[PDB]
Amino acid sequence: SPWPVWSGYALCFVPLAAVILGFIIAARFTDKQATSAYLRLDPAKAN
Amino acid sequence: PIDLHDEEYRDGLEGTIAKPPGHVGWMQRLLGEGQVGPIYVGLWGVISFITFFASAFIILVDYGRQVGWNPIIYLREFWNLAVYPPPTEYGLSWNVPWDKGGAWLAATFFLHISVLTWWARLYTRAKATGVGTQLAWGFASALSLYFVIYLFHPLALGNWSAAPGHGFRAILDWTNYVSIHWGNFYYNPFHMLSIFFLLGSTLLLAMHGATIVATSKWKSEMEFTEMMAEGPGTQRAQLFWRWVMGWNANSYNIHIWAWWFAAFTAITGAIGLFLSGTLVPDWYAWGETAKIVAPWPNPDWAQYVF
Amino acid sequence: RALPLPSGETLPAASAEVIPFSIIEEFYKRPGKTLAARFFGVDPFDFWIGRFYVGLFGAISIIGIILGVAFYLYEGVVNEGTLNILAMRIEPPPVSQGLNVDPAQPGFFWFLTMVAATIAFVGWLLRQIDISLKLDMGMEVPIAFGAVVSSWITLQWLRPIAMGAWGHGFPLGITHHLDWVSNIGYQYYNFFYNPFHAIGITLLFASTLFLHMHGSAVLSEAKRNISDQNIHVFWRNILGYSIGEIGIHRVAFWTGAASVLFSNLCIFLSGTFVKDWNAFWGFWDKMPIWNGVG
Amino acid sequence: NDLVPDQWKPLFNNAQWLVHDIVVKTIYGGLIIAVIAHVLCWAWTPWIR
Amino acid sequence: NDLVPDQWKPLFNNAQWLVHDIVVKTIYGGLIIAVIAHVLCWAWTPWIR
Amino acid sequence: NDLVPDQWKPLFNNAQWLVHDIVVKTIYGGLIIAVIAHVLCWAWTPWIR
């Protein structure tokens, strides 16, 4: 009675947990590889 | 290794039909490049064309029968004409009178064939030029929802009448009728995920386009050249977003984000539509069992009545 | 040895060289070009706390953010007591109260939340203008964000003020603004038939399509040795037109910006001038060309 | 390159020939089974009537 | 690349042959089990009737 | 790359062999447990009836 039925969890908290976790992991990995060290053109010349 | 010239001009079946290229002019001044150029026709190309022309012909002739072959009336009521699938009686039976629901079946069959052959064309032309085949798989992701709407959902319900009806206003009516039938379609959770992904997709598109146009001055538009060596433009674009929202991505990741958002939209949509008729008959009655409906014991209805 | 590349690939051995990220931040700082400092002669803060740039517009924004979150939590947790975000509803003052607002009457905290949120959004927009002004890029992102801000302004300020009730603003709260949307959509029959509405959803679907196509196009040519004209040839083989590199980004920006504008127009119009949308199309049947041929 | 007979030499490679043989054999078997299955569904209930 | 017989030499590599053997064996076993299972659901309740 | 027997040498690396062994052992154990459970649920209440 006080609790949400089964399939409330499966249908609504797979999205609400999985999407937030996915965003917070994917952002970490994209920002890591972006702010990493690799080939660039010099600021003092190209610009 | 790969000759582009022999892939731009090569007779027929293995070549392009419109050999002379043309210029649009006004497109050149506002859209960048503005040449129309040749279009390649292969084996898979001719099939989709003829099947689509067959389905469209079937549908267009059946419009005329409804108006009595009157071109004045035909032009007046063109936007609300439609052809509808069979009624609930003889739900899945394929033997129905032509005017009642028989014309719909042939048209939808030829449409299916055309769609699949166009997919094959995409895949083959992608392999021929030496580029990857990601576009074909994305088109397959969208075809998933397309096939759930027209084939998989009417099947497993017993009625061909669940599918839409090949009309300009018929598709809006289909959307409305399905949402009303299940009841409070807003509460479907996979519908919520699909809306999340769709609005995220539009967000990403607007942002990527806007920032790239803003930093165009330093030749940041050529995303292929920048992937090998990041110039000043890409360096500025990273710094702008790093200070605003605290993190950023280079030119290679942002396109992964784009692809995956666009595809998750359609996949979650298909999964969510399929479940409405079979597992969960009433969506709002399900939401109140999941404890996510606002109590609203006494609303103020003075706003809604005029 | 091996050359790390932006796409993650490491090459088997150009003015390009491996430069660590920090170098490129120190060179592009240039403090003092803030849009605000132009007007006052100086900017109060401009000190880049952490990774975040701070300005006069950033401070008023953060004020709005903190106050709005606090008022949102005060509503629905206190005076409702539901303790469930999905169940709580934050409701505007009733239509009988009119345009005037009173602390004793209910809805006073909804109004505070709305005003704080508006302040925060506008401050954010000005901060974006500012940070772009320092880098000397251009003003496209402020415009694209201003479109959606104007949509928010239409929904919560212009349309309620024109009708005057203040009850017309959509109630905050997860899974209850949907009830407002559903009761407003059916109040005027056939919202689908609305022309300005149908252009918005057309542009939304077209935008998702463009995004998928551009993403797949760039991902396909990512890691391979090709002339860079291969993608253009592929695009000419399929549908016989290649937009170009500079063309697709303009189109993305424009479609994205246009969708929300048509949408806010449609809603503001529905509230004020049109009672139902089926009666709007009553004129089409009687067009002289075909009024008597039936 | 030379296992195919002369009449069909311009068309078929060597490897393409054995596969063509497999295809013909499979098609013949399938046709026999199809004919049998058809005779059986009339001995059950005729469709034309 | 010389474990496969001569007639199928232009088609199959050496490694591709052993896989093919595994596939054929699995298909035969699956067909036997499928035939047994259909005889059983038949004996249970026929479906053509 | 020489711990695998000759018959499977062109397919399996050295490291890929031990992982295979683990996979086969796990699959056998899982099948035994699956058969036991099934016998138990049948003794409880049969599902074909």
Place this chain on the structure above:
Amino acid sequence: NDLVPDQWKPLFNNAQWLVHDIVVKTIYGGLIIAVIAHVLCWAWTPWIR
């Protein structure tokens, strides 16, 4: 990488071995506690009935 035995030398580094040991010990302890807890909830009220 030498601390690992020869059989598993091509797979495990030297540092990866000690963490594997910790993982195995934790898994064994968890399984023992899980078995005890299931015996208890049963004795309380059986679920299959």
Place this chain on the structure above:
Amino acid sequence: NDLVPDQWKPLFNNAQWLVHDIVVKTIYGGLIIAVIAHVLCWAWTPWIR
């Protein structure tokens, strides 16, 4: 980078060791307090009943 014992030398730096000590001490204290609090809420009103 020589304060950690030899068995855990390849894993832990020197600075990473003292933090690990703080973490272990905090976890032990927290577990003791958690056990006491659970005994107290079992004496108040039991939850399994």
Place this chain on the structure above:
Amino acid sequence: NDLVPDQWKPLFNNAQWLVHDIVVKTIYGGLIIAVIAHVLCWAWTPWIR
């Protein structure tokens, strides 16, 4: 630098030490006040009951 004791030398700079002192003092004062306030809002009306 060199004002911090040797045990914590690898972790703390010189400036980071004084701030740590301030933090510890503030935390102790806050805990004392929190304990007093809890004793008071208990003597008033208990919450466990």
Place this chain on the structure above:
Amino acid sequence: RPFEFRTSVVVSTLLGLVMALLIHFVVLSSGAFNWLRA
């Protein structure tokens, strides 16, 4: 050799197949032959 032979056979076998299918559908749906319970 302006007219490629294979284009002719491709378009021929597509048009023939589509035409057979369309006629078969129309005749079945007309309901005038007592074929498959009619």
Place this chain on the structure above:
Amino acid sequence: RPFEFRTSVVVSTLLGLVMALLIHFVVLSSGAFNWLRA
């Protein structure tokens, strides 16, 4: 090579499969055979 053999076998096996599936569906849905509770 004017005609690639593999294109022929691909289109053949696709057309045959689609045709078998369509005929099976039509015959099942006609309801004239007493097959699977009919």
Place this chain on the structure above:
Amino acid sequence: RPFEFRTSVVVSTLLGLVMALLIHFVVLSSGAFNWLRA
């Protein structure tokens, strides 16, 4: 080289799995076998 073997086995195992699943679900949903409370 004319046909890749692995493409054949991939498409074979996908088609077979899909077909088994579809038949299993049609037979279950027909309700003509008294299987799992029917």
Place this chain on the structure above:
Amino acid sequence: RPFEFRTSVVVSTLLGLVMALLIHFVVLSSGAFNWLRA
């Protein structure tokens, strides 16, 4: 070196002002003090 003093005073003034404003709003809206016609 570790902490800029001005960041501390900025965050301090902002937090204090927001907190005073929030408490003043809550107390006014509670309606328990008979202040400005209550």
Place this chain on the structure above:
Amino acid sequence: RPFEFRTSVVVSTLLGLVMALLIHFVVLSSGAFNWLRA
């Protein structure tokens, strides 16, 4: 050290103006003073 004089006067006259404006609108909207037809 990083405290300039004009920044102080700018922030002072902005905060003062905003605060005066907010207090008037709250007092006006409270409706407890009979000012401008109340």
Place this chain on the structure above:
Amino acid sequence: RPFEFRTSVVVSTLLGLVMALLIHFVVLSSGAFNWLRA
């Protein structure tokens, strides 16, 4: 190494935690155990 070991342990811990949580929530909401006033 065909696999990175740490990917295995990450996915293992995540799957185990999610599975324990899901089972604990299903058993609690079933209401068949008289646990926490049931």
Place this chain on the structure above:
Amino acid sequence: RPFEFRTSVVVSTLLGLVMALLIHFVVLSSGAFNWLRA
């Protein structure tokens, strides 16, 4: 250093403030203490 000290103090003072605010809200809205006309 393996951890920046200032990150620790920032996250500590944010978490503590949020937690105090949340507990103060919950206790006020529970209505079990007779505080500010209750």
Place this chain on the structure above:
Amino acid sequence: RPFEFRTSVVVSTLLGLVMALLIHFVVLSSGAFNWLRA
């Protein structure tokens, strides 16, 4: 270093905090303990 120690402590303290908060919420909302007027 195959595994960074600080990642472990970060994920540990996040998971522990979330878990304590979730259990506290569930126990409070169950209404089976007579705690804060229940």
Place this chain on the structure above:
Amino acid sequence: RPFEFRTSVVVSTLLGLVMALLIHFVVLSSGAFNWLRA
């Protein structure tokens, strides 16, 4: 030179045709001429 002649003739023959068609439609649909059973 200021105008291409062919643009003029194109727009002229389009406008004239559209105008003739529109007038013919309006006159027919007015029903005031007794033309084609009226």
Place this chain on the structure above:
Amino acid sequence: RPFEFRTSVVVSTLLGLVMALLIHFVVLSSGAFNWLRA
């Protein structure tokens, strides 16, 4: 060179086929011939 012959034959056979199909549809749907149960 000025007029490709194959364009002529392509457009001719397309127009002829479409025209035959349209006339047969119109005649069938008019219902004035007693053809296929009419």
Place this chain on the structure above:
Amino acid sequence: PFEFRTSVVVSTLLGLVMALLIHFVVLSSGA
């Protein structure tokens, strides 16, 4: 350095902001 042009211009801008504000707020009243 105070230019004294900034002070007068910001004065006038504040003046006009207060202008439209006070004027509309007074006009949109009961009495």
Place this chain on the structure above:
Amino acid sequence: MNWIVATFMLMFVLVAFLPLVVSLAYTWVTNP
């Protein structure tokens, strides 16, 4: 009353429309 304010708010909606047009015309001009 109602209609004066309504027209004035519609003005603001069209002003929101305005900036996108300036973007388009700037691109047309500065790209001969």
